Amino acid sequence: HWGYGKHNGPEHWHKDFPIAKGERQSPVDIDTHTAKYDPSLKPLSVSYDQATSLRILNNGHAFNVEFDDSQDKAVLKGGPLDGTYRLIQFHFHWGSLDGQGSEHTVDKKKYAAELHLVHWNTKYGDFGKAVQQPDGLAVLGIFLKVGSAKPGLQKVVDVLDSIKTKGKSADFTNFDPRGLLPESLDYWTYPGSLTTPPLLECVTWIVLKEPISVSSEQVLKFRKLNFNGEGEPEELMVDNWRPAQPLKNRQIKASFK
Ligand SMILES: CCOc1ccc(S(N)(=O)=O)cc1
Ligand SMILES: OC[C@H]1O[C@@H](O)[C@H](O)[C@@H](O)[C@@H]1O
Ligand SMILES: OC[C@H]1O[C@H](O)[C@H](O)[C@@H](O)[C@@H]1O
Ligand SMILES: [Zn+2]
Fold it and tell me: Where do the DSSP E strands lie in the chain?
């Protein structure tokens, strides 16, 4: 199955997922000088006050914090988006070392990790139908650098020892994703794809310019997770990021002048 190792990693994915070589793949390098301010972007609205987290799952690639998406409890609107996008899950990508781990890069800079808050367009009824549409998903991406601890991340960090291996899950109710945001909502946006198989070209990417700071101790606990299942030889869950893909016939727009 696909993964991140030498024998099943990003350079192999195209054999089972030929869209890996498609026209709007993610992530990309964000060339900040080329990105253009877009006055047509409306104000971005992150409305997470009524979010209902449910569970945290190690899926063998990352860990997902899952939300109740059976109604508009936590939504993203505005910016480049037409209509309402409902939060379904968040997860991270991270490195073996602080010098790599992000999927998007900024003028080729790699951050230590990247948070993805995944939302689906409610006009399509369900996530599964949304991923058949060219505007089905919106992913809010947030870079992580290593410095001061992020207090709103600590609850996530502290549950990871209970989901060490692939297929383990734990209750994760009453988690507030607002504690993962930076101060500024300045962003870059472009049309792209899922960054993991099936690599579907459904995503409006919204990548915040301001990183959040997390402590070394916090990211070190991400790196204690395992890709493998219980009882199998330990393979640390590190370097679960896809590198930047060709921009092709796309422009990155900036929300800020
Ligand atoms: C069912 C797969 O759902 C996904 C896969 C990848 C992403 S990401 N890494 O592009 O945010 C989101 C949802
Ligand atoms: O033709 C001019 C237009 O070119 C496009 O590629 C840019 O996105 C627009 O901002 C610009 O106004
Ligand atoms: O908010 C997410 C989780 O944080 C901590 O683990 C709490 O002990 C738990 O009750 C809660 O589900
Ligand atoms: Zn992701």
Answer: 29-30, 36-37, 42-47, 53-58, 63-67, 75-79, 85-94, 105-106, 113-121, 137-146, 169-171, 187-192, 203-208, 212-214, 253-254
